[PDB]
Symmetry: C2
Subunit: 301 residues, 2 copies
């Protein structure tokens, strides 16, 4: 639209976004910056829009005529509108993913997966859903929807939030003072807290220790709501029996992380909250035109 | 209750049932017959009730004074009432298990599980639920509930039944003539047919070949609704890309089955439809007393 879009992400496939954006706006110039250094071909003065996830330090300084940033979900950030994607179904896709992770632990699937590799038919003691206590940590739009969906499956569902909540069929706890008792009664815990200065590192060693021994831990929020070092330590001591982790302190998860080789951890690479090019491209193309006509942008953060 | 109960199952834990039954009826004599030969200690004339799953040929001939059989879910069967367990929530537990299996395939979890063992961060092309066609084969009480639950997750859900069905949000097909078109448009297929002479071996080589190449196959019905030989063949040719199998022609699944070592198959050992001792024991104890007072038995088959 009289200017180029640059794409950067180490956790998203540039080409799929390029195809979707050029389908939605034929002859839009989309330039994929290289993961790592952010090297991008072409005249950087022509770049007016940036679609990015955690780009390299100094990345935006490459593009003096940038008019619009779009985050794929501040020291060098210019003085321009910043938008996020509004995908009306992410709430659904996230809730469905959480249900998968909760059911996988509640039915002891990790034990069965191990047994199959051993060639053996495993016997476990049957339990009803109602005997399984599942705690959702965070009851914003995403956490509340996941907690309501879990309650449909018969689990003893609890939730925690900083502020009072009333969610039908969910045992809601609130405040920092209630966090130890909330954690102590959660056999399976789902981290779904937005990441702010008050939630950064909230699931530290002290909070992890409030969980019952043998707890099952699911993280779909952000790596650093959770202290990764402390999590690994709890997994090594058997305090947490098993985990499903979709988000990490550094992503892609570095090769040397001890999490990869742990039999009792499932590493998923940002599957819960993935942006979908086909359904997000239209709102990006529309914001390009708005910025170019001096109209306010949709979904500004 | 003036007589002993004998338990037999190769797929259920005798001791858990004994504990639950003796909790519910203190001093009820519960004798666990040994898997394989069915050897059971004690005077067999004192045995009046049998709680069983697929007992050995000739097993019931051991117990001339048998008054009641309870199936844990005919050539030597005596002329007595036969009951099944009525667990009002099996419909829920089954639907929850099907949702787990469908989500596991729809999010390509088997590929990610492989990637973690390789120590690598895998990139897949994102798809909406609405682009994924999921077919439920069988729309009886269990299949209809699973199909309705799947539709809540946004999938393009279809179902098949021998007779017409109207299920809100589900594309329903009916009749044998409709089976090829039903299968050809199902990317993920869930077998949930009850096992009768008309459904035995229905998913044979010819029907499997109607599925699209790369289909994902889930079996939670009964091993022999599906031709196991033909299934293995389709898996080997890549016609079926991956599978989740909870039921088999012979159970426990013999050690030499090729299914155990297949990377693209998850073997689960009868988890979808498992009987729960604590919640089933009361109705068994009540039927013992009814049979002993000459009252009709609950849940007769």
């Amino acid at each position: 639209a009289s200017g180029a879009l640059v794409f950067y992400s180490a956790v998203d496939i540039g080409q799929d976004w390029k195809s979707a954006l050029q389908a939605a706006h034929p002859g839009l110039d989309v330039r994929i910056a290289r993961a790592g250094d952010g090297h991008v071909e072409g005249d950087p003065e022509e770049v007016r829009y940036a679609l990015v996830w955690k780009p390299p330090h100094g990345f935006f300084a490459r593009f003096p005529n940038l008019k619009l940033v779009i985050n794929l979900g501040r020291d060098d950030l210019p003085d321009v509108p910043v938008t996020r994607l509004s995908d009306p179904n992410m709430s659904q896709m996230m809730a469905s993913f959480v249900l998968f992770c909760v059911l996988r632990h509640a039915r002891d699937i990790p034990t069965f997966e191990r047994a199959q590799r051993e060639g053996r038919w495993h016997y476990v003691h049957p339990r009803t859903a109602a005997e399984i206590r599942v705690g959702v940590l965070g009851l914003g739009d995403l956490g509340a929807a996941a907690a309501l969906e879990l309650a449909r499956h018969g689990f003893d569902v609890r939730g925690w939030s900083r502020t009072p909540k009333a969610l039908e069929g969910v045992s809601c706890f609130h405040g920092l003072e209630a966090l130890p008792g909330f954690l102590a009664g959660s056999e399976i815990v789902v981290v779904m807290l937005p990441l702010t200065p008050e939630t950064r590192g909230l699931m530290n060693a002290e909070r992890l220790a409030h969980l019952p021994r043998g707890a099952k831990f699911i993280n779909v929020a952000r790596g650093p709501v959770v202290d990764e070092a402390a999590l690994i330590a709890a997994l090594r001591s058997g305090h947490i029996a098993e985990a499903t982790l979709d988000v990490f302190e550094v992503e892609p998860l570095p090769v040397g992380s001890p999490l990869w080789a742990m039999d009792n951890v499932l590493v998923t690479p940002h599957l819960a909250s993935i942006a979908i090019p086909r359904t997000a491209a239209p709102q990006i193309v529309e914001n390009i035109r708005r910025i170019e006509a001096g109209e306010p942008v949709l979904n500004q953060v």
